[PDB]
């Protein structure tokens, strides 16, 4: 019981990816980006939900309640923002290209003394990607500064013990600067009783005209209360409470 989006077209998959790609836990995907990137021009749920005027304000938010033992999967709110989810206030950025939830990145600065996206760039807020993705020639340098170790095949490993000492990386958005600590940007894995620490950055080139793009995944979003606003076409961040 919550809301009922009528006349929604969707997809029934008769053949879909394995458990190795989509986990047993998730049955499907519910995209929340603009119609322009919608497969076969199918009007997205939220849009329909907008047309049917089912919510007070055409916006929604994600709170990664990742604090104790809350509900896994974060907390999405359709309709508005909620004070309880943040500390202080939200700061917004205008959406630059109405396809992905794309905006403008000012610059990424690494504690050491390195600066990437030096003259600003494009970045899309993506709750579906985990890694922070960026231009390979650009991120190759970051991987370096944080002292990550490139392996063959692609993973830039980081000694599990050395994590605490890695340089905090700070992205500058809307003139404001959001922080990321190694604990936050260093993805860890555990298998058969052993953990593996590795970098959370991805060196991957997005072929234009959509790319070049920096994809801001959950390594960033899990840290800040994020609001996606369709009425005004902006994205706001606030320290997640």
């Amino acid at each position: 019981g919550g809301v009922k989006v009528e006349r929604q077209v969707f997809g029934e998959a008769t053949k879909q990816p394995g458990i190795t790609f989509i986990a047993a836990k998730f049955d499907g995907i519910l995209g929340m980006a603009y119609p322009r990137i919608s497969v076969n021009n199918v009007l997205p749920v939220f849009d329909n939900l907008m047309q049917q005027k089912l919510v007070d304000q055409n916006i929604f938010s994600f709170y990664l309640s990742r604090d104790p033992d809350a509900q896994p999967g974060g907390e999405l709110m359709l309709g508005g923002t909620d004070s309880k989810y943040y500390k202080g206030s939200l700061s917004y950025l205008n959406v630059t290209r109405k396809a992905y939830w794309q905006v403008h990145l000012d610059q990424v600065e690494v504690a050491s003394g390195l600066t990437l996206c030096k003259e600003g760039c494009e970045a899309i807020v993506d709750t579906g990607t985990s890694l922070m993705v960026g231009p390979v020639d650009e991120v190759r340098e970051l991987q370096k500064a944080i002292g990550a170790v490139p392996l063959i095949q692609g993973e830039y490993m980081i000694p599990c013990e050395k994590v605490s000492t890695l340089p905090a990386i700070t992205l500058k958005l809307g003139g404001k600067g959001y922080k990321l600590s190694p604990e936050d940007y260093t993805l860890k894995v555990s298998q058969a009783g052993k953990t593996l620490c590795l970098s959370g950055f991805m060196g991957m080139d997005i072929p234009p005209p959509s790319g070049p793009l920096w994809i801001l995944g959950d390594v960033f979003i899990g840290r800040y209360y994020t609001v996606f606003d369709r009425d005004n076409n902006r994205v706001g961040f606030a320290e997640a409470a």
Binding site: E12, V39, L76
Partner: protein
């Protein structure tokens, strides 16, 4: 944006929604980088682990469902995700 970089195996933002009347619950990944909704279908081509543990949509059991049938098949990075379009009422959350 390549599907390789997509979580989906450990996505952090998911929740339950419903399709049909009565609503059929499905846990999906709330994904701000895509714009389509899709769930498994009862008419799965193969009886694999995916068709076993996942929840699948059954339109036979839905008073609101409206046929469409436009078949689709995009090569979701690694493989191909295929099925067909269908119309119905979505509920958030489900239960």
């Amino acid at each position: 944006i390549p599907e390789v970089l997509k979580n989906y195996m450990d996505a952090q933002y998911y929740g339950e929604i419903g399709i049909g009347t009565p609503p059929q619950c499905f846990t999906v990944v709330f994904d701000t980088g895509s714009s389509n909704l899709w769930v498994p279908s009862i008419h799965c081509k193969l009886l694999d682990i995916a068709c076993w543990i996942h929840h699948k949509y059954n339109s036979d059991k839905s008073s609101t469902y409206v046929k469409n049938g436009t078949s689709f098949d995009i090569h979701y990075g690694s493989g191909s995700l295929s099925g067909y379009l269908s119309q119905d009422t979505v509920s958030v959350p489900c239960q």
